[PDB]
């Protein structure tokens, strides 16, 4: 399983497969630099990173105002089906400004594939993306090498000092192929599946992202949500080792209302430290105005009901529209002000 693979910038605008071999090109090759790696690196040393200080400004504002992410934070997308998720992803690659875009699709379907690499195709930013895959139709070792591969992809492009962000798409089925695999050899499953390396192998994936003294790589992690929440433990597993999530909704999709976040349920464990001290007061101004807005749910009525509708209207954003920090504090301050008031 311990695999060394080809990275470099060959690879920027190239499709790999779980090996490192380029299947496919959206664009010309950038340059022929590479070097081979473990793909199964241990993280830095706690000792040798910097702490999550500068944000990352994601172009979203409902991200920006009441979420903002950190350069080097390593965030959640907790979504079921039809939440909207992987058009949230195009628009954070969209929006974002970073050197390097690094994506690992992990047990997704082939037409799933195929279909984000023909998104990447249309991006004006195509050369900075690395797409790595695995498809259903591989073991699940290979399902595993995959996020590990993308994920020392965006490793030496921090080392080239280049700001990196890394996609993982289920991390749940990262999770159960490092279950599979350990399963697959000698090893004991009576925790709920999982034996004990899968346990110890999770925060070994999700450690080597964050920043270093100059390059980082900025990470997103998705996360199903099955459709029950009553038997829900790798989720809740997963969340304790994130420095914050991103919570996606049945029901604002079901509404149509994009980019389907229920910022009740989200946090960045990095706002009060990435935030100046003037937004930060506005987000929890906004916070209790939203909780107060959906605790009243059951013309001092019709004043609170046209403000849940202004709310919740710049709260949603197509993936075309684009909002600077400046403007999302901008409304963020109007939203507080309903709140003095
Ligand atoms: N600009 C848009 N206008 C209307 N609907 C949109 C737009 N962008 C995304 N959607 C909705 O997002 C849904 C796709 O969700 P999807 O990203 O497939 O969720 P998941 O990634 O969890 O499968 C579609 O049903 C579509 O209605």
């Not at 959640?76 to 939440?83: L, V």
């Not at 989720?235 to 910022?263: C, F, M, N, T, W």
Request: some cysteine; aromatic content about 8%; hydrophobic content about 40%.
């Amino acid at each position: 399983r311990a695999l060394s693979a080809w990275v470099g910038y060959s690879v920027l605008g190239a499709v790999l497969d779980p090996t490192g071999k380029i299947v496919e090109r959206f664009t010309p090759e950038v340059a022929p630099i590479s070097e081979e790696r473990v793909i199964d690196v241990a993280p830095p040393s706690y000792a040798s990173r910097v702490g999550v200080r500068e944000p990352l400004i994601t172009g979203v504002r409902a991200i920006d105002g009441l979420l903002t992410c950190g350069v080097g934070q390593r965030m959640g997308i907790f979504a079921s089906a039809g939440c909207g998720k992987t058009m949230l992803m195009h628009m954070l690659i969209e929006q974002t400004e970073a050197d390097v875009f690094v994506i690992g699709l992990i047990g997704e379907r082939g037409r799933e594939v195929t279909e984000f690499v023909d998104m990447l195709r249309a991006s004006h930013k195509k050369e900075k993306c690395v797409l790595v895959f695995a498809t259903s139709d591989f073991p699940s070792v290979d399902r595993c090498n995959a996020a590990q591969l993308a994920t020392t992809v965006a490793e030496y492009f921090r080392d080239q000092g280049k700001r990196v962000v890394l996609f993982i798409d289920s991390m749940t089925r990262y999770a159960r192929a490092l279950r599979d695999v350990a399963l697959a050899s000698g090893e004991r499953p009576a925790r709920r599946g999982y034996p004990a390396s899968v346990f110890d192998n999770l925060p070994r994936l999700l450690e080597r992202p964050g920043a270093t003294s100059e390059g980082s790589i900025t990470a997103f992690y998705t996360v199903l949500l099955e459709s029950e929440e009553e038997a829900d433990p790798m989720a809740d597993e997963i969340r304790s080792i994130l420095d914050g999530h991103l919570y996606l909704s049945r029901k604002l999709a079901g509404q149509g209302h994009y980019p389907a976040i229920d910022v009740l349920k989200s946090v960045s464990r990095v706002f009060g430290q990435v935030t100046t001290p003037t937004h930060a007061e506005q987000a929890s101004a906004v916070r209790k105005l939203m909780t107060r807005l959906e605790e009243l749910q059951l013309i001092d009525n019709d004043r609170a009901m046209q403000m849940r509708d202004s709310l919740k209207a710049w709260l949603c954003q197509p993936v075309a529209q684009y909002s600077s920090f400046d403007d999302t504090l901008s409304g963020m301050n109007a939203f507080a002000d309903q709140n003095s008031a």
